[PDB]
A paper describes a structure:
Neuraminidase (NA) is a receptor-destroying enzyme that cleaves SA, facilitating the release of viral particles from infected cells. Three mAbs—FNI9, FNI17 and FNI19—stood out for their binding to a broad panel of cell-surface-displayed seasonal and animal circulating IAV and IBV NAs. Collectively, we identified broadly neutralizing NA-targeting mAbs with unprecedented breadth to seasonal and zoonotic IAVs and IBVs, which can synergize with anti-HA stem-directed mAbs. Owing to the functional constraints associated with the SA receptor interactions, the key contact residues of the FNI mAbs are highly conserved across IAV and IBV NAs.
To elucidate the structural basis for the FNI9, FNI17 and FNI19 broad neutralizing activity, we determined the cryo-electron microscopy structures of their Fabs in complex with NA from H3N2 A/Tanzania/205/2010 at 2.9 Å, 2.3 Å and 3.1 Å resolutions, respectively. Structural analysis reveals that D107 in the FNI9 heavy chain complementarity-determinant region 3 mimics the interaction of the sialic acid carboxyl group with the three highly conserved arginine residues (R118, R292 and R371) of the neuraminidase catalytic site. Although the analysis of the static structures shows similar binding energies for the FNI9–NA and FNI17–NA complexes, the MD-derived total dynamic binding energy predicts that FNI9 is a stronger binder (−370 MOE (molecular operating environment) kcal per mol) than FNI17 (−250 MOE kcal per mol) for NA from the H3N2 A/Tanzania/205/2010 strain, in line with binding affinity measurements. The interactions are balanced across more residues in the FNI9–NA complex than in the FNI17–NA complex both in the epitope and in the paratope, providing a possible mechanistic explanation for the superior binding of FNI9. In N2 NA structures without the glycan, there is no clash with the antibody and the 242/252 loop adopts virtually indistinguishable conformations in both bound and unbound states.
Author numbering:
A (entry chain E): 1 to 130
B (entry chain G), C (entry chain L), D (entry chain J): 82 to 469
E (entry chain F): 1 to 110
Amino acid sequence: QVHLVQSGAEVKEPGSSVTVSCKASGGSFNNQAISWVRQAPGQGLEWMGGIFPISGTPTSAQRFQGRVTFTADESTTTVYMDLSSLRSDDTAVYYCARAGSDYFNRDLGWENYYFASWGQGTLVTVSSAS
Amino acid sequence: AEYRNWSKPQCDITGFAPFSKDNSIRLSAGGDIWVTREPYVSCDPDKCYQFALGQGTTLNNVHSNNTVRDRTPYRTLLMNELGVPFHLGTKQVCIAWSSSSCHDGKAWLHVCITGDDKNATASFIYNGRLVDSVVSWSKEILRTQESECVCINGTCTVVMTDGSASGKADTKILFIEEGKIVHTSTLSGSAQHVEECSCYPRYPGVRCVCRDNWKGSNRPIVDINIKDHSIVSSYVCSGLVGDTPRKNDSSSSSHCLDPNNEEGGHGVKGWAFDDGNDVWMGRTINETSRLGYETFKVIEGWSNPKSKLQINRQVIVDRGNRSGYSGIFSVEGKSCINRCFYVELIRGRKEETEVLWTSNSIVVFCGTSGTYGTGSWPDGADLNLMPI
Amino acid sequence: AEYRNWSKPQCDITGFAPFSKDNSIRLSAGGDIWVTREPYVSCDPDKCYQFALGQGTTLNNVHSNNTVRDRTPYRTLLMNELGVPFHLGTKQVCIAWSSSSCHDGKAWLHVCITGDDKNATASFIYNGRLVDSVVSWSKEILRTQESECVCINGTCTVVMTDGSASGKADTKILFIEEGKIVHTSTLSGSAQHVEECSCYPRYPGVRCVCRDNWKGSNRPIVDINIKDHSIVSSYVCSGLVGDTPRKNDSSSSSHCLDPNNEEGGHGVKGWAFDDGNDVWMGRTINETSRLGYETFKVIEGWSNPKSKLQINRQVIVDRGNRSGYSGIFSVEGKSCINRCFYVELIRGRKEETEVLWTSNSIVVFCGTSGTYGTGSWPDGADLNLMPI
Amino acid sequence: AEYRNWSKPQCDITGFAPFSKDNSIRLSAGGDIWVTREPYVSCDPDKCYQFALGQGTTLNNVHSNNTVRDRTPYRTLLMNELGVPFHLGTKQVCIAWSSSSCHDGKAWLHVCITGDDKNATASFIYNGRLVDSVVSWSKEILRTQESECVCINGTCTVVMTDGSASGKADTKILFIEEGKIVHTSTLSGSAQHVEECSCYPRYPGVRCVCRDNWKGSNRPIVDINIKDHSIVSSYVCSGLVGDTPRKNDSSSSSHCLDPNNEEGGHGVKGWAFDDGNDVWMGRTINETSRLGYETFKVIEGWSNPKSKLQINRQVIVDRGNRSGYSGIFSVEGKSCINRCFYVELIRGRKEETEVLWTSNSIVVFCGTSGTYGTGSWPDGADLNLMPI
Amino acid sequence: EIVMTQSPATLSLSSGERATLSCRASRSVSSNLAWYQQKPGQAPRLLIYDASTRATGFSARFAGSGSGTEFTLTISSLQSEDSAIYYCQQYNNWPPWTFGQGTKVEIKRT
Ligand SMILES: *[C@@H]1O[C@H](CO)[C@@H](O[C@@H]2O[C@H](CO)[C@@H](O[C@@H]3O[C@H](CO[C@H]4O[C@H](CO[C@H]5O[C@H](CO)[C@@H](O)[C@H](O)[C@@H]5O)[C@@H](O)[C@H](O[C@H]5O[C@H](CO)[C@@H](O)[C@H](O)[C@@H]5O)[C@@H]4O)[C@@H](O)[C@H](O[C@H]4O[C@H](CO)[C@@H](O)[C@H](O)[C@@H]4O[C@H]4O[C@H](CO)[C@@H](O)[C@H](O)[C@@H]4O)[C@@H]3O)[C@H](O)[C@H]2NC(C)=O)[C@H](O)[C@H]1NC(C)=O
Ligand SMILES: *[C@@H]1O[C@H](CO)[C@@H](O[C@@H]2O[C@H](CO)[C@@H](O[C@@H]3O[C@H](CO[C@H]4O[C@H](CO[C@H]5O[C@H](CO)[C@@H](O)[C@H](O)[C@@H]5O)[C@@H](O)[C@H](O[C@H]5O[C@H](CO)[C@@H](O)[C@H](O)[C@@H]5O)[C@@H]4O)[C@@H](O)[C@H](O[C@H]4O[C@H](CO)[C@@H](O)[C@H](O)[C@@H]4O[C@H]4O[C@H](CO)[C@@H](O)[C@H](O)[C@@H]4O)[C@@H]3O)[C@H](O)[C@H]2NC(C)=O)[C@H](O)[C@H]1NC(C)=O
Ligand SMILES: *[C@@H]1O[C@H](CO)[C@@H](O[C@@H]2O[C@H](CO)[C@@H](O[C@@H]3O[C@H](CO[C@H]4O[C@H](CO[C@H]5O[C@H](CO)[C@@H](O)[C@H](O)[C@@H]5O)[C@@H](O)[C@H](O[C@H]5O[C@H](CO)[C@@H](O)[C@H](O)[C@@H]5O)[C@@H]4O)[C@@H](O)[C@H](O[C@H]4O[C@H](CO)[C@@H](O)[C@H](O)[C@@H]4O[C@H]4O[C@H](CO)[C@@H](O)[C@H](O)[C@@H]4O)[C@@H]3O)[C@H](O)[C@H]2NC(C)=O)[C@H](O)[C@H]1NC(C)=O
Ligand SMILES: *[C@@H]1O[C@H](CO[C@@H]2O[C@@H](C)[C@@H](O)[C@@H](O)[C@@H]2O)[C@@H](O[C@@H]2O[C@H](CO)[C@@H](O[C@@H]3O[C@H](CO)[C@@H](O)[C@H](O)[C@@H]3O)[C@H](O)[C@H]2NC(C)=O)[C@H](O)[C@H]1NC(C)=O
Ligand SMILES: *[C@@H]1O[C@H](CO[C@@H]2O[C@@H](C)[C@@H](O)[C@@H](O)[C@@H]2O)[C@@H](O[C@@H]2O[C@H](CO)[C@@H](O[C@@H]3O[C@H](CO)[C@@H](O)[C@H](O)[C@@H]3O)[C@H](O)[C@H]2NC(C)=O)[C@H](O)[C@H]1NC(C)=O
Ligand SMILES: *[C@@H]1O[C@H](CO)[C@@H](O[C@@H]2O[C@H](CO)[C@@H](O[C@@H]3O[C@H](CO)[C@@H](O)[C@H](O)[C@@H]3O)[C@H](O)[C@H]2NC(C)=O)[C@H](O)[C@H]1NC(C)=O
Ligand SMILES: *[C@@H]1O[C@H](CO)[C@@H](O[C@@H]2O[C@H](CO)[C@@H](O[C@@H]3O[C@H](CO)[C@@H](O)[C@H](O)[C@@H]3O)[C@H](O)[C@H]2NC(C)=O)[C@H](O)[C@H]1NC(C)=O
Ligand SMILES: *[C@@H]1O[C@H](CO)[C@@H](O[C@@H]2O[C@H](CO)[C@@H](O[C@@H]3O[C@H](CO)[C@@H](O)[C@H](O)[C@@H]3O)[C@H](O)[C@H]2NC(C)=O)[C@H](O)[C@H]1NC(C)=O
Ligand SMILES: *[C@@H]1O[C@H](CO)[C@@H](O[C@@H]2O[C@H](CO)[C@@H](O)[C@H](O)[C@H]2NC(C)=O)[C@H](O)[C@H]1NC(C)=O
Ligand SMILES: *[C@@H]1O[C@H](CO)[C@@H](O[C@@H]2O[C@H](CO)[C@@H](O)[C@H](O)[C@H]2NC(C)=O)[C@H](O)[C@H]1NC(C)=O
Ligand SMILES: *[C@@H]1O[C@H](CO)[C@@H](O[C@@H]2O[C@H](CO)[C@@H](O)[C@H](O)[C@H]2NC(C)=O)[C@H](O)[C@H]1NC(C)=O
Ligand SMILES: *[C@@H]1O[C@H](CO)[C@@H](O[C@@H]2O[C@H](CO)[C@@H](O)[C@H](O)[C@H]2NC(C)=O)[C@H](O)[C@H]1NC(C)=O
Ligand SMILES: *[C@@H]1O[C@H](CO)[C@@H](O[C@@H]2O[C@H](CO)[C@@H](O)[C@H](O)[C@H]2NC(C)=O)[C@H](O)[C@H]1NC(C)=O
Ligand SMILES: [Ca+2]
Ligand SMILES: [Ca+2]
Ligand SMILES: [Ca+2]
């Protein structure tokens, strides 16, 4: 089946950076955008950004625009997300998701940008503890 | 012949009088007319031409379906004398999904952009032949003005952008001589986002008013020096802002240096120009959709960021009828330079689901020192009756 | 090049010979042709052009329905070389529901009127660009000649009216130089109503014969002085009257100074010209409807108000076929100025209910000093068979 | 005006940038467009023209059926400015089922071939009028370049062949001055078969790269001397061969003097040009059918017969889309001669049985010394939906 | 930029009865609205899109309603598996794609 598969959990020290990845089980990376959404403990959902796997246009939420970068590879059929300058507050579950959207108009923007399918979620925690 | 220099003073404008209309969608219901979007107007020393990016199809045609996408391999730059609709005899001057054109006083320059989203090419065509080319520097949809370029003493200038629409992007100003790229300057000053500039000669330099898709509902300004290639930028001071969407005039604000951060995301291509301390400008009548179109003068709106004192309002299209992109062009008179503008009248998908196609008509107005009355000049086509 | 002066004498006319025909309604039954009314003809120093006010649609089109109204936002001035029918490649020169055009010897002037009934604008377009504009002075349907203007030594003249059709109205004569309004004179003399004038050069001045919708079935005359902007007016003396409706030739009368008060209300655009004491003129063959068309000379009809002595009659369209507006134009020959005329051939609604549209063809004749025979040259389209 | 001499040096090419596209098949689904094959491009001193052999019919027409045959009495040479599609207003310049054209710097020369297979005539038309003619010398389908001729100091040259396609044939080089045949040379050197040559000015002489239907999958070369009418010939050395069909790049070989005898029978019209010891060339992406199109540079490929070292590849049409004939043309710049090429995009019968007709679109590219990106520019028409 | 307000904050009802949830946008989103269900300890799941149509994982008992600036979701005959948190999300043409703060459903059993 098509479904997304994510990388394992991580502990990182403050000021460090973390890499999370997401791969399609079906090898079927069509141009539908892959997006990253996070969930802090006992808190609501938060969109961070995304990328079109073939056309390669990346996008990021304003709060993360200096801190996050996205890249993709059709060969590994995997999307990679890097989050920099980590702090305790970034401790959250990070989910990759597949959007209903597959084209961007210079003038009119996006269409159908809702999440149809989600990954397993990766727990990332920021701490000094061993 | 000699190269253009635009060294005459600006004419004493009191408002705008009607100049031309195309009727393209009404004619299309019984005729072979091209599907288009993103039109513009420019003039040689003798007469004016209308330009548009075709969708490689006529309107009553199976290939007219799904014509909503802005980038495809088939788009070409169409060219006609002003007032002649785009019929099957129209000339295609280059392959393009984005463009700009101007006449230097000896021959036409066309700037044409095509290719893959992440590896596009820009071709420079002058006096009928390809003279130069350059490739996307940030690998994310290379784009230009969708309106005329400006040339002084043979040196033409064009604004080009690469990168994100909702974050920092790379903007460059290219200096061109007979189609050859001679210099390049990176954007400088306090403008944070620059798209779809509308430019006008302001001897000895060039001035441009642009679209900010990221944070401003106030419009960015770019000043270009032709003698030393230097660049500076800022924002339109006026408390009455020109972008769409925007806040209502009762609550909107502006800053001379920074994006106002009010309904900043998204926008629409527009224009404004200086008249001493006053500013002339046009905008959609509605604040959150591309409906109607109005123009007016704002007292001290070029230098005072708190001014909301408007005068000389004109309706061009009433609030119940669709509008679209708009842009300035300049015409040389016997003793002064006049300013004129055009308005894109978009019809069909995605708003009007009665049809499968998307296309536009146009209307054109020119600055007058005389007197004028009132009216409304919409598109006028009946999409309930004509071909789906 | 130099400005026109028309300083040659008038040619020795013995009658009129055929010159051109368009066949527009016959071609429309299988082709893409524009819907029009109120046509006219004018010539530059090298060749003649046909003009018409389009209804912003082709004939075999859903937008052709209800094309009977004279004022809408979509009307534009069409222009072609004489003899080329109005196909989809035709140029639209301005937005207009009323107009006039002329060539000064260096470039074309177009006078274009549009806007709200009670607040209309007049735009002056010269050498391809808008040069001046003026607004309705009486706030009640500003209107002009629907025929060519006349220019001497660079100064063009145009007659304009505002106000009621069935009472006193405000008529002005505007003097124009390279599109700039340089002077204005108010109507003077005994003419009491002045609409749709037909004008001709009569060096050193200009002379115009007009429509009286209020009280005359005799036509008003207006003489214009180009050197001092003075105006005088009167009526056509001839006992054989030129307007429609009118009384029959057995009972009609006229006055050289006043409206004859015979069937005075309503009228139709026409022409007449002086030939010493004689007058040449054209009119509908029927007295109470726009059917057929005839021309003739009236002996002493320019100076004797009791004369009914006609000679040299020609039928142009026979009494069973529709006619419409008609008007004079002047052509410069090798040693004299010739007079030529055109006739609008109206078809469709409201009289012909076989179709939903209203449109016209044209036919054109020129003065000859030679000899001629007979014929009839109607529209010729079969409305019973072609598209509804 | 003066005759062309092409005495400027060749421009420093780094690859090819997009220049034009016609969209003929997409427009044909709702418009009156001519049926064509065997197109080509040529330019006067001011602008470029597109040429094609019409099938004497429009596409949505009963006469469009069975348009696959290359010789019929109705074929004519069509001519338009580059970019204007072949609509009903297009000029037919001569009767022809084979042709070539060029501009000498003063006027156009057209070489037009028609008549019976075994007794055909060649007509030489210069400055609008027939100047000379010649008859088939071997009585077996007289034929020429299907692409532009080349002229230096007023003397134009054209390659012509008569006789078998699968055996020895009679090839002659004709020297023409203002339409008059002034000299003729028979083919000389080691080339054994010469069809459909593509020629380019290489001052002081002319150079041509051709099709070998008999034994070579490597292309023949012909050098022509304009001052003494001498001829010499050979083959393209490159181990990467330009004809179709051919062996794959893993197993193909070539010889500088002889046909390589690898998949030699049949072929397709193409081009190549010298760049010191390197060669620039274009070919179908597929080895055994006319699918896709690519260009590249081969290091030492003009002088070393064992070289397979390629660089600067570009895809023009991807491997899933149809191609056809292709050919070079030359354009004079401010200081150097540029090389440009065109590609025929064939659609319909015999491969695409969804329709009864056969026709083509085109795409055009020019050499650049700047930079460029990537893309694919196919025909784009949907034969499953448009008229059969 | 566009703020999504969702109410009530918490809802509790017995099994075999109808339940209703509501969402409001600070500007009109022209039907560009979707709903998600998240079961405890699992990734969210798409329930409805374009304010009107339900995803393959859900049956006729779930219904969407509203347009412009106000929207509603209704669950028919509540069951043990419905005990979950639900969120609305807008997607009107331009970023960011803001979610509502969510509503928690717990079942009022004996
Ligand atoms: C036929 O054609 C012609 C040409 O098209 C039409 O004329 C044109 O009509 C429009 C109408 O919108 C005019 O634009 C409007 O101009 C006013 C500003 O001008 C007025 O107010 C001035 C200031 O008045 C104050 O101060 C003076 C002292 O200085 C005091 O005495 C006053 O009491 C006030 O306190 C004043 O200087 C102006 O005078 C000049 O003009 C008149 C003629 O109009 C002359 O007699 C004078 O001699 C002198 O030359 C004048 O009185 C703006 O207020 C308008 O914008 C508001 O209205 C819009 C809708 O109309 C609305 O959409 C805008 O948002 C805006 O409304 C907002 O702002 C208002 C204040 O600005 C608020 O009060 C309001 O609640 C809201 O918040 C608009 O810009 C054109 O100027 C005029 N053009 C020409 C060349 O004359 C004519 O209408 C047509 N006729 C018909 C029947 O079709
Ligand atoms: C082939 O083509 C040619 C060219 O197109 C055709 O020829 C043209 O034919 C028309 C016919 O209508 C002519 O127009 C008409 O002209 C007459 C007036 O002219 C006649 O009367 C003149 C005056 O006669 C009196 O005075 C003289 C002395 O001066 C006396 O001798 C007489 O006795 C009278 O008292 C007279 O001078 C004319 O002679 C000249 O012309 C003829 C040719 O016509 C020559 O033979 C002569 O040599 C000489 O050169 C002439 O006899 C008008 O009366 C006509 O208008 C009336 O008729 C119309 C219909 O025909 C009608 O509809 C009008 O309403 C009008 O009728 C009313 O008025 C009448 C009086 O005017 C009343 O009697 C009547 O009851 C009614 O109330 C008309 O204007 C053209 O001139 C002629 N063209 C040319 C250049 O020659 C030819 O017909 C074609 N051939 C064929 C076979 O079709
Ligand atoms: C966006 O647009 C731009 C511009 O259009 C795109 O760039 C263009 O990309 C194409 C890709 O096809 C390039 O053409 C290709 O060129 C290579 C030859 O060049 C490479 O190899 C050179 C030699 O390398 C050997 O030797 C050196 C030591 O000298 C060693 O270090 C190496 O290890 C090797 O042993 C080398 O000199 C070149 O370097 C130069 O160019 C690069 C950029 O490419 C620069 O970074 C360098 O600084 C330097 O300037 C270079 O690395 C050919 O090999 C290609 O042909 C093969 O591949 C085709 C498919 O790509 C295939 O279909 C052909 O049949 C052919 O394959 C066959 O032959 C191969 C060997 O030749 C075999 O390995 C293979 O199995 C098979 O048998 C092709 O000609 C363009 O040059 C380039 N244009 C420009 C102007 O830069 C860019 O790609 C676009 N981006 C995107 C995302 O779309
Ligand atoms: C129309 O204009 C003519 C003059 O001609 C016009 O102007 C030229 C520059 C060209 O553009 C022509 O194509 C164009 O038609 C007027 O005629 C002129 O009138 C004046 C005043 O009566 C005469 O002035 C005199 O000129 C002599 C020298 O020639 C002096 O010595 C005298 O002291 C005096 O200034 C002039 O001679 C005369 N020219 C001719 C050729 O006759 C014409 O009056 C005018 N008419 C109208 C109705 O506007
Ligand atoms: C092509 O023709 C040129 C000459 O130019 C041509 O003819 C002109 C009238 C125009 O129609 C031009 O547009 C057109 O191109 C030839 O150039 C000439 O080459 C010769 C030999 O190298 C030169 O000869 C010398 O000339 C001087 C006098 O100028 C004598 O004193 C010497 O004794 C000797 O003959 C000649 O200078 C040169 N001409 C020019 C204008 O540069 C060219 O050779 C020819 N090329 C080909 C391929 O046919
Ligand atoms: C910008 O370009 C314009 C041309 O479009 C330049 O205008 C030209 O300026 C010169 C010098 O003033 C004029 O030449 C002189 O004209 C007079 C009168 O005809 C003549 O008697 C003299 O012998 C001389 O030729 C020229 O006519 C004028 N052209 C026009 C159409 O006005 C202008 O100088 C340039 N501006 C700048 C700032 O460089
Ligand atoms: C109205 O315009 C016409 C032109 O359309 C004027 O006629 C022209 O007048 C000039 C000045 O007299 C003539 O120039 C002279 O011609 C003679 C003979 O060739 C020559 O020897 C002189 O040196 C001088 O060039 C010109 O030829 C003449 N044109 C024609 C066609 O006759 C006319 O004067 C104007 N009328 C008025 C009332 O001003
Ligand atoms: C090939 O054809 C071109 C024209 O297309 C020839 O170029 C022209 O050659 C002549 C003679 O050399 C040039 O005239 C001279 O120019 C100089 C510099 O301007 C001037 O000082 C002299 O007094 C003289 O007029 C002419 O300008 C030149 N044209 C161009 C556009 O450069 C060329 O000679 C031909 N080549 C060969 C090989 O014959
Ligand atoms: C201009 O904008 C402001 C801000 O949106 C409007 O103020 C709101 O008006 C609505 C009713 O239309 C109220 O429900 C809100 O409570 C108001 N907001 C605040 C902060 O008070 C204002 O009404 C708009 N003006 C016009 C004339 O439409
Ligand atoms: C501004 O334009 C908008 C959008 O065209 C108008 O909003 C629409 O109003 C109608 C009723 O009049 C509704 O049926 C639509 O659903 C609304 N559309 C959207 C997208 O919300 C609005 O009325 C206009 N407002 C003003 C002040 O001009
Ligand atoms: C010209 O007009 C007069 C006036 O209308 C007509 O005279 C009338 O004719 C009818 C018969 O047709 C009589 O019943 C009336 O009594 C007449 N009126 C008068 C005042 O006597 C005359 O018939 C017309 N003549 C022509 C030739 O058209
Ligand atoms: C290039 O050409 C050679 C010669 O035809 C190909 O070699 C043959 O490949 C087929 C399978 O495609 C085998 O069945 C044959 O036994 C091979 N013949 C020989 C002589 O080895 C080769 O596969 C081609 N390679 C490519 C990349 O196209
Ligand atoms: C080269 O082109 C040929 C002919 O167009 C291709 O042959 C087709 O291959 C598919 C399967 O891959 C078959 O179903 C078709 O029937 C074939 N077409 C014909 C006309 O025979 C071939 O695949 C291409 N090969 C390469 C290596 O490019
Ligand atoms: Ca904005
Ligand atoms: Ca009357
Ligand atoms: Ca071969």
